[PDB]
Design a protein around this nucleic acid. Structure first.
Ligand SMILES: [Zn+2]
Ligand SMILES: [Zn+2]
Ligand SMILES: [Zn+2]
Ligand SMILES: [Zn+2]
Ligand SMILES: [Zn+2]
Ligand SMILES: [Zn+2]
Lengths: 255, 255, 255, 255, 255, 255
DNA sequence: TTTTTTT
DNA sequence: TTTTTTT
């Protein structure tokens, strides 16, 4: 149990202060690859590195990824604004990998709802790379008032049917003022071998955003990390849910 | 005919006071395997054991398993709070097995609605392990009022279209604030060797929850105990229903 | 034209007083098979036996089977209460068979609406045995008032949107307090043999309740009796209706 | 232009007074075949007979068949009530045949809307014989008021949402109090052999009621008479209509 | 740019005053063929005859056919009322033919929207002759008020959901009170002659009314004149249209 | 970042002032092919030409094609009004081509939203050439007020439910007063020959207007330039969008 | 034109 | 569980 404020700081300290077995501040060397000719938009954090330095925090990103990842991103944000005088940089993703507990798609249960889980499996499908509105800026066509609504890649589009200012039910989505990011859906299912004779390989759908889009093709063995999310089955008539994996970090493996 | 209040107490006694042919308070030994390293969340109760000690009660769990099981669980809850000083432990399932009457899928009818029955048979289907919302929490996006509605794994999702506080018809389900449990659907049919001549084997769909989830695969001979539950089919304006078996306990058998 | 009150009595007398060609009070020997080890829940009345004793009543079960059947059941109810002192016995079905007019599925018309008819044919389909709510006991969740509404196996479910006592539009169906019976749909059509060359058969769908459920399988030649019923052609937006045969008695025949 | 009152009388006179080339009052001989063992429910009037006796009326059943037919039916009702002392007989249909103008399906046009037309053709389909509510008797479940609303076999069911007496919006259809008649749909089209090259065979759907139900099977050459009716195309989005032929009389012909 | 009033007169004059190369007032000779034993309901106007007499008006029927045709019909209405004392005659169609610009189906575009065009082509389809409601009459079933709404054969049906008098949302279309005319759809495409051997022949759908109904079959080489009309595509969401050719005159040609 | 005002001028200058390696004011020779017997309605601008002359502008048409294309068209407008005394000519399209970055259908992403991109691909489909309302003039039928609303070919039809003047909810589109243009949809996908044949090729739909309509058939290898546009997926219960390519120039290529 | 009474 | 961007 650690609140955001301190996490950011602890994360900041982790990044600049962590050193491996050679004195490599590797995370300084990764906050550096953020500012080159071909810049990256995310920082790959090895969980074991975070654990050894501060396991008390490493057991928060797992038990509370929405705050943990978010906080760590504010941390990268700071160690740039301070240690490199860069504020111009867009948003950078905190992508944790190499977790302790490595589940199987069939094992994913309601226990893991909104917890960062790690999953091994094989990709069976990959969708088209489609634009996702990460921030929908609505505009009023009566007074011209602007309304900001952040969206979530697994939740449905959250509109607004009434103006905040003049109360006019004449609101439209302004594509230009809005923020868009690449998005790609994909499915992975436990490899047939790991299972047992009479078992039906079980699959899970997942989401990829920004830089981790188009990183895998059907038939790749992968080890994804990510937040287990839940939603209603299409119809939305019963109290049973759909499991979606909001991927936080994906990494191939040749078995 | 026995109300809850007494059943709780009678169950309490049964648990701590029952002894087999060797003076084993077996249920004290099972209330024990609730507190260990690898804790279980349910007490397997042999019906014959209940019957021999208190057959008037044993004939209530069968005629009224909603009250019956529920009472027994409050019993286990008490014999922990008193005899072990533990109140931290979550909820523990009272799972009855080895009933006297053992039906065959085909003989399951309207007489058994909401009575605990016992069925032997062979699993033909098992669904994905889905999160079920045991207790749903709706949130208003106008006044932020909270409304709690418990759901039932066989009944359809019970929503609320209007705010209890401000009466705003702008309510949404909050996934975090809600409670979830593992859920799995499965089908079983009569063993063919027990049916006669030109009979075609009948089936029945069922539900597993929490600990009993993913305990059986397609092709297993099982003996399930359960509550026979009914609900209206693909419409909602016809007085015909659908038999669903809310399994209370499942146990394998190699014939 | 005979009212219920007198029918009950005339039926009572019929059962106890009727003798065949050997002085067999056959119906006394049948009301007897109701109280045995393996009890039956219906009394199979030959229409010819009723006609010969009282044809003025036998022409009432045909022209008014709702009253006719109902009255004859109160008669079996009384001849048990008086002649055998039994009042514990549940409800017994008066099922008439062997009528004079034996129709063919294609001949069934508007004329027969709500008259007891007799049909020969072949069974083409049989549905699953689902529970039918014969008596919906609605409960208010504001004042706890109880409302009883009998249902009809062909008609749509008749709910109630407002409380009879407090007028609260918060009513629900109570499964337990309600009475359920086994139900099974089935379809019979004309034998394409006695149906002109390269023509086509028009079938009928039928209903079975309680004891007569699961008595036939697809391919059986049967001779059913029953009430011809009618209901709005699926989507209730046209003046045309659908013929349903609420079966009152079914009997096989090997041709 | 002749009003109902007079039409009924002239029709009455026609029936009893008409004598062919042998002094046969044939229509007396057909009002006769109404009262026998195997009674018919319609009088088959040859238009040519009507025309020669009264051609000014025969040019009314064609230009205004809803009045014409109805009037002639009251006339048959009267020439039974006076000349045979029968009033018990139900309703009898005045079915006209053998008109001057014999149309081809493809020729039936807007001109003929609501005129009695004659059409030769080939039956391509016949529907099931369903019950039609010719008179929907609505019953109020608050005051028990009764409301009669006649229905038309091509128009949609006309209900009534409010009580005529107490104004309670709790009205239902009473199956028993209502009048039902046999109904059967069927389609006929010009036959491909009779067409002039590029043209592709056009069909028309029709309605049969009561006695004329189930008179034809698919593949019969027929010469129907009837009232050309119009309705919206299923969707009801465009000002273009569907041609339905309310049959008034049908007669086979072996070519 | 000429307003209606003047056109009517200019047309009136044209009809009675025009003479060819032999002094034939041909149009008088055609307004004549209107009154005969076998009357026609349309006057075929050659555009070249209209052009030579008054080319400033001829260039109005093309640029504004809706006014042009309509004015010319009022003209024919007048030169009957005055010059022949006939007012009983119904409505006569002003059908122009032989225009200067003669398009090819593939050349028909947005330019031509609502301009009278001329198209040569080959008929590939013809629909059934259905009744169109040229003038629809709505009647209120609460106060009985009547509302007239003229329809257009290409646009969708224009209803009215609220009463003009009492404002009751209980309005229906009265078939009888309404006016219907014959209607027939048809398709033509470019005749696969003049059209480079590697083009996919483009086509267009058209509408015929009254007297010009059923004038061509599939496989006819025709020269149509017509108003190019558009309507919102499929969903009526999108700002896209559909080209329909409301024919104003059709004429065969044997190549 | 350059505002419209200046771009117009800079573009004006570019057109009249640019000279190749031969002193050819090529664009003067092209603004010339605008006035001739067979006039074109678009100026085809090589990006490279714009780039060498003014590379700070050429990196605006790409980064801001709405403003950029628009601007250049006002420039073409001016260099006609001044240098040729023509103001009668309609609207001329500025169509850039031969861009530096030439994407592949699968590569097109969120980054390119509203930027002019270049795409090589193979045409797989082409739609019918339907009229598009580029400017919808709405007319009120109560006061006669006119309201201009420009449309976009990919966005849905923007109507107006209320009159600007008298507030009458009785508004209709006036087809005449509106401006229309030919429209044609078409799909292109990467060629799977130049893409590991173990992948499923991905496509993109596009829009063609005016003069670029009907320039390609299915199977053509093309190099389109255009604006990448986004709209929601059919249903619209997702913050996930659909990519459409509003073509700004299309050119064939024989590989 | 509408395509089985219910699937 | 969902089944492709879509007629
Ligand atoms: Zn506003
Ligand atoms: Zn609220
Ligand atoms: Zn109440
Ligand atoms: Zn009433
Ligand atoms: Zn009214
Ligand atoms: Zn207005």
């Amino acid at each position: 149990s650690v609140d955001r404020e301190e996490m950011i700081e602890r994360f900041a300290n982790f990044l600049r202060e962590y050193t491996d077995e050679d004195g490599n501040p590797v995370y300084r060397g990764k906050i550096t690859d953020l500012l080159t000719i071909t810049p990256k938009r995310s920082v790959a954090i090895d969980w074991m590195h975070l654990n050894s330095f501060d396991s008390e925090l490493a057991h928060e990103v797992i038990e509370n990824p929405e705050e943990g990842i978010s906080a760590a991103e504010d941390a990268i944000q700071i160690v740039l604004r301070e240690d490199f005088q860069r504020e111009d940089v867009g948003k950078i993703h905190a992508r944790f990998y190499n977790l302790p507990e490595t589940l199987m798609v069939k094992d994913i249960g309601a226990e893991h709802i909104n917890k960062l889980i790690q999953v091994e499996g094989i990709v069976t499908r990959v969708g088209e790379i489609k634009p996702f509105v990460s921030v929908a800026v609505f505009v009023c066509k009566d007074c011209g008032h602007e309304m900001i609504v952040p969206q979530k890649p697994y939740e449905s589009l959250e509109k607004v049917k009434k103006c905040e200012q003049c109360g006019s039910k004449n609101i439209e989505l302004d594509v230009n003022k809005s923020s868009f990011v690449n998005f790609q859906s994909f499915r992975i299912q436990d490899r047939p071998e790991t299972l047992k004779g009479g078992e039906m390989p079980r699959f899970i759908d997942g989401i990829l955003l920004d830089d981790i889009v188009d990183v895998a093709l059907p038939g790749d063995r992968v080890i994804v990390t990510g937040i287990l999310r839940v939603v209603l089955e299409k119809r939305e008539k019963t109290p049973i849910f759909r499991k979606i994996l909001e991927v936080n970090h994906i990494e191939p493996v040749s078995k």
